[PDB]
Amino acid sequence: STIPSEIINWTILNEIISMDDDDSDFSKGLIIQFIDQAQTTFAQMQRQLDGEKNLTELDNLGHFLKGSSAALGLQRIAWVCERIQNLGRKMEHFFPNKTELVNTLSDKSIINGINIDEDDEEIKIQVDDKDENSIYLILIAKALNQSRLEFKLARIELSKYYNTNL
C-alpha cells in the first residue's frame, strides 16, 4: 500500500459533519474525543516500547486508533496505524523513512514552518539485549514517530478548518 496523499479525506469528514443537524457539537465533539484518544494511545504505545515490549498490545493499540482515525477521514494516521498492527503481527518487515512519507503529501508545502522531528521519541532498547523481536519493536517505534508527525499535521489542518487550536 501507498500512504494516502491527503491528510483529511473530505468525503468521509463531510459525511460526519452532515450528521450535525444544528450547531456542530456532534462532529467537533468527535474530533476533540479523537484528539484525546490519540494522545492516550501514543503514551500507551510509548510505555510498551520502553517497558513490557508486548507486540500484541502494540498491535491492539494500532488497530484501536486505526478505526477511529479512519471513521473521521484522518486517513494518513489510519494508514500508519495499520502498519503498526501488521508490524506487531510480524506480517510486515519494513517501514518507510520520514522523508519518503512527507514527500507523498498533496499539500507538500504544509511541512514548511515546523520541525518534523519535534515530537520524536527514541526507543529504549538494548543491542546488547537484541533478539528476533527487535526489528518489529524498532520499526513500530519508527512508525510511532511518523504517527506523531501525522497527528500534528492533522491538528494543523483541523485547527485551520475550525479556526481554533485543537
Next chain:
Amino acid sequence: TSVKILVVEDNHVNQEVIKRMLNLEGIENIELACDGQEAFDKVKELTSKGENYNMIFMDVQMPKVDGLLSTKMIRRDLGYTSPIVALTAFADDSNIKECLESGMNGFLSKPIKRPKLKTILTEFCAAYQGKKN
C-alpha cells in the same frame, strides 16, 4: 422499540458514529457493548425475554473476548439465530473469511458509509423500513 440493534465496539468514537447513522435511519433502540463478554451477556439477557436483537454489529478486536469468540459463544451457547455483521477496522480476505466462518452473516469495514449501511439493513434487518430521497 420495534427494531432493536446491538453495537459491539470498544472504541467510543466508532460507537458514536454508527449510533448516529442508525438513528438517522429511524432506528432509535440501539444498545452498546464494549467487548465480547458484555455482548454475550446482553444477548443472553434478551434471550430470556424471548426476543432477538434484529441485528448485531460486531467489532473484531476487543479486550477480554474478541468478536470472533463472542460470535461463537452467542451461536453455540445461546439460541442465537439472527444476523451478526462484522463492523471492524479490518481488512483483507483472511479477516472476512474468518468472520463468516465464525458464524457472522456479513462484513463491513470501517469507515462505514451511510448508503452502505442502508444496503446491509435492507439485506439483514428484519422489521427495518427505509426511505427515501
